[PDB]
Coordinates of C-alpha atoms (C1' of nucleotides) and ligand atoms in Angstrom, one line a residue:
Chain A
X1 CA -40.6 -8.8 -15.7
X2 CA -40.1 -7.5 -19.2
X3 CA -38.7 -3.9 -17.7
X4 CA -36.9 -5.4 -14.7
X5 CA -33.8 -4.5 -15.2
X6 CA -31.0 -7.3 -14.7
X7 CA -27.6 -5.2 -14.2
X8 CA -26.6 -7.2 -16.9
X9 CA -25.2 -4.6 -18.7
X10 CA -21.4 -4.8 -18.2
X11 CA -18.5 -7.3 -17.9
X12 CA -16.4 -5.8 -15.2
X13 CA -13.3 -8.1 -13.6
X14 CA -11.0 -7.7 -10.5
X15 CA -7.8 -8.7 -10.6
X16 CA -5.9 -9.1 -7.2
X17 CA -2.3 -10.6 -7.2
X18 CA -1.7 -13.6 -5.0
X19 CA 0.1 -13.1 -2.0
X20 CA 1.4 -9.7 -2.8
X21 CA 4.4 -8.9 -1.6
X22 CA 5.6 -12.2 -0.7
X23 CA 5.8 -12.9 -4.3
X24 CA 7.9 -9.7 -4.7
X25 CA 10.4 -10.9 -2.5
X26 CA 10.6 -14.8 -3.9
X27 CA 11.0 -12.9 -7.5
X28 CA 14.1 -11.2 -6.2
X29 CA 15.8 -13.9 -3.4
X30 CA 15.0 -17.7 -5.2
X31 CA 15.7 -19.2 -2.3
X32 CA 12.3 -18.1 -0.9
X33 CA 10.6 -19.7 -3.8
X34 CA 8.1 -22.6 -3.2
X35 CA 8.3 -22.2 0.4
X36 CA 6.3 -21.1 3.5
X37 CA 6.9 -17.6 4.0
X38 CA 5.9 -14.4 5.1
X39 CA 7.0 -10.6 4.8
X40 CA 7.3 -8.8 8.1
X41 CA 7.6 -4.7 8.9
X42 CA 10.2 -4.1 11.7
X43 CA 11.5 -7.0 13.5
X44 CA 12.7 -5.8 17.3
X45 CA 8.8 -6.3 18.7
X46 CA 7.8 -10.2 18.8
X47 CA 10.1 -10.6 15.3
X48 CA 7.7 -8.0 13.7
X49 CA 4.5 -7.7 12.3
X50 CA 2.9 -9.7 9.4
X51 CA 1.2 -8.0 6.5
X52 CA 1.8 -11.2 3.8
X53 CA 1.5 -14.9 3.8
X54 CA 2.6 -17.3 1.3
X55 CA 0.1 -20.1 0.6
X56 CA 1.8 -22.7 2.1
X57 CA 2.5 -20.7 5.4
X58 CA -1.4 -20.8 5.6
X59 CA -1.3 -24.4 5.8
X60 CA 0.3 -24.3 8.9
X61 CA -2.7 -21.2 10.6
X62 CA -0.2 -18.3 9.6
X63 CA -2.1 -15.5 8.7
X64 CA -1.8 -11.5 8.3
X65 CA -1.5 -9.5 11.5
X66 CA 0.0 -12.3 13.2
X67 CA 3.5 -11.3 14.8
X68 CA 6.7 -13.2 13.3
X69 CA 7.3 -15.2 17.2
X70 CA 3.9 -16.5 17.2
X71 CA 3.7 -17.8 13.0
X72 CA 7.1 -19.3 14.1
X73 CA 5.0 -21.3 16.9
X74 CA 3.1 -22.5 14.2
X75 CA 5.3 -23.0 11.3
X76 CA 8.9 -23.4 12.7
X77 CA 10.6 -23.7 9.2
X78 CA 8.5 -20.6 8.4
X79 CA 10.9 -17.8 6.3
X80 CA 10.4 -14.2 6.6
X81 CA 11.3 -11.2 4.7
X82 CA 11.5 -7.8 5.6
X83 CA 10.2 -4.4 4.7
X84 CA 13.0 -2.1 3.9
X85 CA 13.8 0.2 6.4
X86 CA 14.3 3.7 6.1
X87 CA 14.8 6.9 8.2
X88 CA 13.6 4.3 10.9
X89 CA 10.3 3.7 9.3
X90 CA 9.1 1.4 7.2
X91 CA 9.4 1.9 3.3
X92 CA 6.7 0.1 1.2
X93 CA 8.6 1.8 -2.3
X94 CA 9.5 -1.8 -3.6
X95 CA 5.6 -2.9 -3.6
X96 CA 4.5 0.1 -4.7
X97 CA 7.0 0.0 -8.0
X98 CA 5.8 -4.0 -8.5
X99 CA 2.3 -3.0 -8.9
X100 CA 2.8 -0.1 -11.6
X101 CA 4.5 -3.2 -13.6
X102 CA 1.5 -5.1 -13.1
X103 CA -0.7 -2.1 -13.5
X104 CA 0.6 -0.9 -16.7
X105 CA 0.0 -4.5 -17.9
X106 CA -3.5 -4.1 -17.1
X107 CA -4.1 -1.3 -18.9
X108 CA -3.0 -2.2 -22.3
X109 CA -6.2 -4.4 -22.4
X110 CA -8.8 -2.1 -20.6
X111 CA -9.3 1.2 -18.5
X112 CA -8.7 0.1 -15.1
X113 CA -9.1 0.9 -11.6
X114 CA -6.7 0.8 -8.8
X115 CA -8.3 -0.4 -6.0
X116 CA -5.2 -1.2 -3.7
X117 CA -1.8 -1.5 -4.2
X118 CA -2.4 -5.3 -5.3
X119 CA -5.4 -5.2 -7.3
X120 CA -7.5 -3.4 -10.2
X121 CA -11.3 -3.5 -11.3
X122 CA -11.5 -3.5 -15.5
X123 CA -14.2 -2.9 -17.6
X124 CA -14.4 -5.2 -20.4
X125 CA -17.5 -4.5 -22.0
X126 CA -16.1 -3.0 -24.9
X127 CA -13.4 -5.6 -25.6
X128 CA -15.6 -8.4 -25.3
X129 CA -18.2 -7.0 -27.7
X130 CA -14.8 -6.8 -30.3
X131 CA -13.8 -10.0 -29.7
X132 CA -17.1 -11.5 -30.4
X133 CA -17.8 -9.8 -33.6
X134 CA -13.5 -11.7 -34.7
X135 CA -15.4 -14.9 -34.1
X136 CA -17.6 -14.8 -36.7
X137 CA -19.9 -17.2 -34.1
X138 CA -17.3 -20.0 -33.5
X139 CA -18.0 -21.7 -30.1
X140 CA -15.5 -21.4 -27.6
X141 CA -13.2 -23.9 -26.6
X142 CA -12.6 -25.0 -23.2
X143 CA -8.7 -24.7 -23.8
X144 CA -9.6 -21.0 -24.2
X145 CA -10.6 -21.3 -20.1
X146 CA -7.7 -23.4 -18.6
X147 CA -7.8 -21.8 -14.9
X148 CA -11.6 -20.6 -15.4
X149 CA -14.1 -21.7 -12.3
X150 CA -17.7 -21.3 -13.2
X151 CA -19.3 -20.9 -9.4
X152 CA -22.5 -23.0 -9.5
X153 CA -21.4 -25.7 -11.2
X154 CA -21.1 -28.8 -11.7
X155 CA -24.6 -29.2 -10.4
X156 CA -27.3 -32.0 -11.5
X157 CA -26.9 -35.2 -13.0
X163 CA -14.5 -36.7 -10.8
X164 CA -13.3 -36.8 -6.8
X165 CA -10.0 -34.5 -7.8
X166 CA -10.5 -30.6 -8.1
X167 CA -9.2 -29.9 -11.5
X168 CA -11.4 -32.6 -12.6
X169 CA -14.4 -30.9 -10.9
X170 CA -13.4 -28.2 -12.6
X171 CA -13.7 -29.3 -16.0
X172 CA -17.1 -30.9 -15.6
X173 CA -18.3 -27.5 -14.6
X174 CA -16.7 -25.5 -16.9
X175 CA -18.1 -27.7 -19.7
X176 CA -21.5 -27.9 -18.5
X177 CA -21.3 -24.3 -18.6
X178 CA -19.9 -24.3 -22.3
X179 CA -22.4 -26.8 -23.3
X180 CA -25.2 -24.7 -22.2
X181 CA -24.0 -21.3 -24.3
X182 CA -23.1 -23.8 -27.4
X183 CA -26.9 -25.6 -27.2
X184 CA -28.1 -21.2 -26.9
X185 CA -29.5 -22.4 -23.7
X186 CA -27.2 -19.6 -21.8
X187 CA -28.0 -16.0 -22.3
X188 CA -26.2 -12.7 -24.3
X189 CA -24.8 -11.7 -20.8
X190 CA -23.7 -15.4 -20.1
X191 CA -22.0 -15.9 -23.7
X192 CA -20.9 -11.7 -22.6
X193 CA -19.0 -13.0 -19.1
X194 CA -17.5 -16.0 -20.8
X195 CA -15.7 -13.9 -23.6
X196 CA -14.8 -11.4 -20.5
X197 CA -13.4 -14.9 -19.1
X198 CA -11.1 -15.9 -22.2
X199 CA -9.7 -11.9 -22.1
X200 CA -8.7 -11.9 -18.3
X201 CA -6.5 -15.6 -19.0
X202 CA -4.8 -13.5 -21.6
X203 CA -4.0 -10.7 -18.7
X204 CA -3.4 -13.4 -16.3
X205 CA -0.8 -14.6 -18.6
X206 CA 0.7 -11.6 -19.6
X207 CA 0.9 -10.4 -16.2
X208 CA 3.0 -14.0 -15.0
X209 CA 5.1 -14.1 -18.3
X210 CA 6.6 -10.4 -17.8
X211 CA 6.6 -10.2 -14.5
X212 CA 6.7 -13.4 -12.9
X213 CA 3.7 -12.7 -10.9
X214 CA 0.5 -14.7 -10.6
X215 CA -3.0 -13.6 -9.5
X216 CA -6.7 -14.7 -9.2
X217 CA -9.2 -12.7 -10.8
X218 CA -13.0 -12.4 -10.5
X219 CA -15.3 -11.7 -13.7
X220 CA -19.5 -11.4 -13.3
X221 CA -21.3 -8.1 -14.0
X222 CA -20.1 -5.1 -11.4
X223 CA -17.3 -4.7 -8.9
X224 CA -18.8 -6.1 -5.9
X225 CA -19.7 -9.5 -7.6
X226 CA -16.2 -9.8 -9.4
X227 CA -14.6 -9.3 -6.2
X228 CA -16.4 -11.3 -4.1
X229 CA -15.6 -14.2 -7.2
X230 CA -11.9 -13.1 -7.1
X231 CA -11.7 -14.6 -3.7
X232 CA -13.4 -17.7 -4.4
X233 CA -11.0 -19.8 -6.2
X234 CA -7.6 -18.4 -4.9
X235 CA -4.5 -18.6 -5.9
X236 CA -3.7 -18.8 -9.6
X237 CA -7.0 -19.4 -10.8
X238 CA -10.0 -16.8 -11.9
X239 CA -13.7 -17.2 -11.3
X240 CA -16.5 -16.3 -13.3
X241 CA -20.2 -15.3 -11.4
X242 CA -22.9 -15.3 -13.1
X243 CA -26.5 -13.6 -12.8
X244 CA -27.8 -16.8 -12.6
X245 CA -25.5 -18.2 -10.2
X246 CA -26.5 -15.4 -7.7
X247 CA -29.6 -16.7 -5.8
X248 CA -27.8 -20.4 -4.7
X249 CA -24.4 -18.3 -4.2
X250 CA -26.3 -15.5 -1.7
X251 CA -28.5 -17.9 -0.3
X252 CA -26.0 -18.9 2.3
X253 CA -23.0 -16.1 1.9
X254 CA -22.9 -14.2 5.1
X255 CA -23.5 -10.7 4.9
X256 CA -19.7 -9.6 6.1
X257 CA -18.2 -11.4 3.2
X258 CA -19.8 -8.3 0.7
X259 CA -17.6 -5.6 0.2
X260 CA -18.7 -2.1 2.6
X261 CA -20.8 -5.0 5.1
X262 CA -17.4 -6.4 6.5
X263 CA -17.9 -3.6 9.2
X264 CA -20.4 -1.7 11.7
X265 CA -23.4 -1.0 8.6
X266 CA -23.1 -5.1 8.1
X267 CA -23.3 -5.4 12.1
X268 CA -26.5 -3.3 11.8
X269 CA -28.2 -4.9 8.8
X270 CA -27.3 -8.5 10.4
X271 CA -29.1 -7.2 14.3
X272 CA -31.7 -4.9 13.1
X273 CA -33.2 -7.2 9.9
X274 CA -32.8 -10.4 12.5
X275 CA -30.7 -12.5 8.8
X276 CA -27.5 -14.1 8.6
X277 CA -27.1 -14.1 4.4
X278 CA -27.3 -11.9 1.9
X279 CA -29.9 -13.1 0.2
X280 CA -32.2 -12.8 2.7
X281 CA -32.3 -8.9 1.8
X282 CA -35.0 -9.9 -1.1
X283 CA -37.6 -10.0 1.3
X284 CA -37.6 -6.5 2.2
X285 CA -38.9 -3.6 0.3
X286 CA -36.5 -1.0 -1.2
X287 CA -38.4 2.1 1.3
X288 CA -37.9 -0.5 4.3
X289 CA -34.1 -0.8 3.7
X290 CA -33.8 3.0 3.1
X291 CA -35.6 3.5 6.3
X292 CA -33.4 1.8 8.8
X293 CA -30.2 2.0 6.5
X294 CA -30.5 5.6 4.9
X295 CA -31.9 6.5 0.9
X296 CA -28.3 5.8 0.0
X297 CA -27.4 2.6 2.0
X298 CA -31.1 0.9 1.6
X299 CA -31.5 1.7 -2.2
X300 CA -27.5 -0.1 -2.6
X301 CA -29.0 -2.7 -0.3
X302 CA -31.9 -3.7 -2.6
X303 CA -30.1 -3.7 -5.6
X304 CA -27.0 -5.7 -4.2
X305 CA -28.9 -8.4 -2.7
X306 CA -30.4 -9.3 -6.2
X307 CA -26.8 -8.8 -7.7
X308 CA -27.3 -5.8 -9.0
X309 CA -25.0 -2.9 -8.4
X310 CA -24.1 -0.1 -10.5
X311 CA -20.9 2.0 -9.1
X312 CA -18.8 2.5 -12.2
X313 CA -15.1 1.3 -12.7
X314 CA -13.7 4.2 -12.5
X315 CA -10.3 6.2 -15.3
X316 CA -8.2 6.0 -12.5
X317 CA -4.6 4.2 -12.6
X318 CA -3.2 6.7 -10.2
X319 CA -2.9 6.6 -6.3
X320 CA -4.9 10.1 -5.6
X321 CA -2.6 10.4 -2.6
X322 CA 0.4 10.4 -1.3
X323 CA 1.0 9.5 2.4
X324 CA 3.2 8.3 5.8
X325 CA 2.6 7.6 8.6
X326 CA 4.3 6.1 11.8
X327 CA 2.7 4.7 15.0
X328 CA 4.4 5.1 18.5
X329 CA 2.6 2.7 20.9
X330 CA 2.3 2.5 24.6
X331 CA 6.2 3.8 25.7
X332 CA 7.5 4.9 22.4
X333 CA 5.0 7.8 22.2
X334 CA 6.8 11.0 21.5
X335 CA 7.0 13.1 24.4
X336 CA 9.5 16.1 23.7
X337 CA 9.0 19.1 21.1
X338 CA 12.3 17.6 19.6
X339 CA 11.3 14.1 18.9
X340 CA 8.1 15.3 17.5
X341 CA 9.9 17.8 14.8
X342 CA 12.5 14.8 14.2
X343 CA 10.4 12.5 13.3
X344 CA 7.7 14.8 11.1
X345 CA 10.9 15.5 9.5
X346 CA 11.9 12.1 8.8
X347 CA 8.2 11.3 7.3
X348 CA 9.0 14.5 5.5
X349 CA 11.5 13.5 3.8
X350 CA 10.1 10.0 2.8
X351 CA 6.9 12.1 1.1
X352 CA 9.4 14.7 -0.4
X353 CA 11.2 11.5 -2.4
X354 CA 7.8 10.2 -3.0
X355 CA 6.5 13.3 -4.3
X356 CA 9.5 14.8 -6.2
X357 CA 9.3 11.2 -7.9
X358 CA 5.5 11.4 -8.7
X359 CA 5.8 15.0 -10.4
X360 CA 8.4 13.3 -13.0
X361 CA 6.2 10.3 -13.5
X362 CA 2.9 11.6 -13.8
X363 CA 3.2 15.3 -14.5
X364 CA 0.9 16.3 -11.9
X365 CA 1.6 18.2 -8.2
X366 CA 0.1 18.0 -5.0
X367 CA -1.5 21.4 -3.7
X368 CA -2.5 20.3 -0.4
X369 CA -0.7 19.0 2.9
X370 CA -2.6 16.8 5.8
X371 CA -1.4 16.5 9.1
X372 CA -2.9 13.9 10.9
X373 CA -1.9 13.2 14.7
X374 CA -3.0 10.5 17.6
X375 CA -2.9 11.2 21.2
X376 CA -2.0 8.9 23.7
X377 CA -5.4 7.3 25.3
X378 CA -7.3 7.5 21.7
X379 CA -8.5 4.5 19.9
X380 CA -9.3 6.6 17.0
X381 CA -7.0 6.4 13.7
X382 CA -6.9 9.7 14.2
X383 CA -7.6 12.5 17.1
X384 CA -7.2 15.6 15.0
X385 CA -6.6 16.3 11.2
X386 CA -4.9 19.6 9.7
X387 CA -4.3 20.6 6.6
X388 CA -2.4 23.4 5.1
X389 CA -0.9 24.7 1.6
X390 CA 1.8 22.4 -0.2
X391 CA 3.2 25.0 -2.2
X392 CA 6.8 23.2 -2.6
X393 CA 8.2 19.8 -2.4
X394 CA 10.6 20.5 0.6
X395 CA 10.7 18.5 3.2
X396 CA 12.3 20.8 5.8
X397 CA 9.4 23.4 4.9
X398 CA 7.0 20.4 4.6
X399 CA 7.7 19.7 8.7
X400 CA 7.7 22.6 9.5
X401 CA 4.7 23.8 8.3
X402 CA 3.2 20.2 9.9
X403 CA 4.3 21.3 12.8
X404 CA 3.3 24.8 12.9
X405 CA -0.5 23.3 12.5
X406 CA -0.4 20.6 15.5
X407 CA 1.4 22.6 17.9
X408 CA -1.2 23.9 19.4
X409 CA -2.7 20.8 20.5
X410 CA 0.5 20.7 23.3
X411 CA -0.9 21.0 26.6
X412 CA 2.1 20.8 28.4
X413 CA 3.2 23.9 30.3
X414 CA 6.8 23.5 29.2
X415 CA 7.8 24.4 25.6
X416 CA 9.9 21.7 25.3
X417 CA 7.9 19.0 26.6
X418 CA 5.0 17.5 24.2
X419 CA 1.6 16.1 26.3
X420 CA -0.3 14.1 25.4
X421 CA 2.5 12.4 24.3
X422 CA 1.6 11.3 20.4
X423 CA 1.3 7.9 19.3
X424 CA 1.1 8.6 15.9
X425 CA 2.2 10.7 12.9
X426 CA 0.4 11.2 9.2
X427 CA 1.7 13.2 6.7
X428 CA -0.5 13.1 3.6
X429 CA 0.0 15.0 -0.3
X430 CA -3.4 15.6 -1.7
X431 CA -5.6 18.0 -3.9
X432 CA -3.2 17.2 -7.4
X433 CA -3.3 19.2 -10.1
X434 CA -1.8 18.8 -14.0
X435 CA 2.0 19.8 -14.1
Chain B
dT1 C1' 3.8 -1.8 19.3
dT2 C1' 1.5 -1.3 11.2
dC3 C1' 1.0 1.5 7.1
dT4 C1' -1.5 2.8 4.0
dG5 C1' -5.7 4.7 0.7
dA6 C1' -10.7 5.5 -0.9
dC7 C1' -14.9 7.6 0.2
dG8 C1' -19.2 9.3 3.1
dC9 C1' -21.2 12.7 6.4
dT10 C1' -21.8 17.1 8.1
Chain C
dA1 C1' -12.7 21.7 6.5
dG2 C1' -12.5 17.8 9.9
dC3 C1' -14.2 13.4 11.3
dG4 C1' -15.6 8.5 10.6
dT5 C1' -15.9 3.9 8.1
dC6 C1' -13.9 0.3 5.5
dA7 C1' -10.4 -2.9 3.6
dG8 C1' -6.5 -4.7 3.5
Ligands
LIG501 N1 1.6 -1.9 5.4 C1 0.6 -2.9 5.3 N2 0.5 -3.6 4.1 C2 -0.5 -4.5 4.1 C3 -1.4 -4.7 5.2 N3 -2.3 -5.8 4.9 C4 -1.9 -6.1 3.7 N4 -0.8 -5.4 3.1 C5 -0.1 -5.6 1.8 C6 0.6 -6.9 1.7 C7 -0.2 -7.7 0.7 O1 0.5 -8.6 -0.1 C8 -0.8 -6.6 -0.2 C9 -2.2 -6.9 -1.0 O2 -3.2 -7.1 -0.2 P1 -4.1 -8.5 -0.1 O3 -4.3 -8.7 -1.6 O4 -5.3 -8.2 0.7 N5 -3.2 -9.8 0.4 P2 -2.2 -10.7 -0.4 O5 -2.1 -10.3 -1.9 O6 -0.9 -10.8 0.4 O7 -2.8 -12.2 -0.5 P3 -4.1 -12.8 -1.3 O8 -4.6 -11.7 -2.2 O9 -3.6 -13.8 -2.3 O10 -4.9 -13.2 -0.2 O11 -0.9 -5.5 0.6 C10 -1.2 -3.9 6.3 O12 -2.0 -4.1 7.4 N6 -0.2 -3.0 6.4
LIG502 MG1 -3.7 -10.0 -3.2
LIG503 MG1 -5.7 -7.2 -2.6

DNA sequence: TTCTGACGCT
DNA sequence: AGCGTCAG
């Protein structure tokens, strides 16, 4: 008891912006505002992929992944905007300059950590531990928490949600007022009153809004990002963590959403997360590995220790293009075309990273798919980057795939490839 | 018929 | 170094 540990030890939040990139594109065209939309890559194949959804396009079933002709099915008045288009690919640079606005916002407040190009971890322990000592022990006002859910509660002894919201967040108030809550608790709820301010400051310079998570590592201030989306931010408690696991299935826990949270589920014979308690720390490590089955253990009690980590940064810089089913690239000339048209995108991207960020990337992965292969990739080369040129960049791509060519013919390319992945990695201080 | 990006294993 | 997993 007295030396368990309780990972209380941190306040660490996750912000993630609300519908991403559809927001980007109803900041810039009005008349997309306030309406069901959706942003689409391409448009020629079944009006084009899906990748973001505007909350009132979910209302009518349209999600990500969907193709534009079958959301229309659903939502007929549905709007779409689409990713820019360049050297016949698609160019995600709009997106990626949106979140260094939000990202730089972030970071005036805490170190954070990019953990997509829509969302950032931030440890808080530091800034809350200031702001308390400023209060001189004042209680804190539930107008200091207008968008704040506290998961949990209301519990014990109003039929509208923002009413139910209130009577939670003030039976959570009364209980750290009374001292009936604990340091950590009182610790969370400062954390809390410091991600409104980013909240805010993110929406009043950039026009965006987001949801945001805040409990005691990254995986539980994730998982409470999600709960309360959009526009509002969600506080997790230790305490809260027994009722909350108790019927959260396994997949919904960041790192179980694939084949290791397939295993755990068939192998254990549970559903929930918190059915993990029941098994010892050696037998998680035996059917899960030392690393896995120690994680495991710790996670299911809502522990978890992985840090947030200095790192604003993307640490690389990539492109890549598929070429399904009869658009796979047969000819030695197709193939150089297009690695020199993803060339060229990375050459831009790169030349405009060096200014930014005084840093250069030393190393060059090629990355290839052959026709017949459900793997992301079939084979993976790298080679020096030793200058930001795309025609030299291709090139040299080429030089180490070429020999993957079965075909007899020197200017015919078999298997034909169905995808192409130029990568910038290994960066160094310029 | 998508386009990324982080990280673990060997 | 090259391959796989995971989260969108
Ligand atoms: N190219 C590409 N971009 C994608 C893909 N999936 C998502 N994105 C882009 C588009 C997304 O806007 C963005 C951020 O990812 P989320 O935060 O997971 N989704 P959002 O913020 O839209 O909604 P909310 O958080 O409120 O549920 O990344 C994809 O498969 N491909
Ligand atoms: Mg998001
Ligand atoms: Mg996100």
């Amino acid at each position: 008891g007295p030396h368990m540990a309780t990972g209380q030890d941190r306040v660490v939040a996750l912000v993630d912006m609300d519908c991403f990139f559809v927001q980007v594109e109803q900041r810039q065209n009005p008349h997309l505002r306030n309406k069901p939309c959706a942003v689409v890559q391409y448009k020629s194949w079944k009006g084009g992929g899906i990748i973001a959804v505007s909350y009132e396009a979910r209302a009518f079933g349209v999600t990500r992944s969907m193709w534009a002709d079958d959301a229309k099915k659903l939502c007929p008045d549905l709007l779409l905007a689409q990713v820019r288009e360049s050297r016949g690919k698609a160019n995600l640079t709009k997106y990626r300059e949106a979140s260094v606005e939000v990202m730089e916002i972030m970071s005036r407040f805490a170190v954070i950590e990019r953990a997509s190009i829509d969302e950032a971890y931030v440890d808080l322990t530091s800034a809350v531990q200031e702001r308390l000592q400023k209060l001189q022990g004042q209680p804190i006002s539930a107008d200091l928490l207008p968008s704040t859910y506290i998961e949990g509660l209301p519990q014990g002894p109003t039929v509208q949600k923002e009413g139910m919201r209130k009577q939670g967040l003030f039976q959570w108030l009364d209980s750290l007022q009374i001292d009936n809550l604990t340091s950590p608790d009182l610790q969370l709820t400062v954390g809390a009153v410091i991600v409104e301010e980013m909240r805010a400051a993110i929406e009043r310079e950039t026009g965006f809004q987001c949801s945001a998570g805040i409990s005691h590592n990254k995986v539980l201030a994730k998982l409470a990002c999600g709960l309360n989306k959009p526009n509002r931010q969600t506080l997790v408690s230790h305490g809260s963590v027994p009722q909350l696991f108790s019927q959260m299935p396994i997949r919904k826990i960041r790192s179980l959403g694939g084949k290791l949270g397939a295993s755990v589920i068939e192998i254990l014979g549970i559903e929930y997360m918190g059915e993990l308690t029941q098994f010892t720390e050696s037998q998680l490590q035996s059917h899960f590995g030392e690393k896995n089955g120690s994680w495991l253990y710790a996670m299911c009690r809502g522990i978890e220790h992985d840090p947030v980590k200095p790192r604003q940064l993307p640490k690389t810089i990539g492109c890549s293009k598929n070429f399904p089913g009869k658009t796979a690239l047969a000819t030695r000339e197709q193939v150089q075309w297009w690695l020199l048209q993803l060339a060229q995108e990375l050459e831009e991207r790169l030349t405009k990273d060096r200014n930014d960020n005084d840093r250069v990337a030393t190393q060059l992965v090629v990355s290839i798919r052959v026709q017949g292969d459900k793997r992301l990739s079939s084979l993976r080369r790298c080679c020096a980057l030793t200058r930001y040129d795309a025609h030299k960049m291709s090139h040299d791509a080429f030089t180490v795939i070429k020999n993957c060519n079965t075909s007899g013919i020197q200017t015919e390319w078999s298997p034909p490839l169905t995808m192409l992945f130029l990568c910038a990695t290994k960066f160094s201080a310029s």
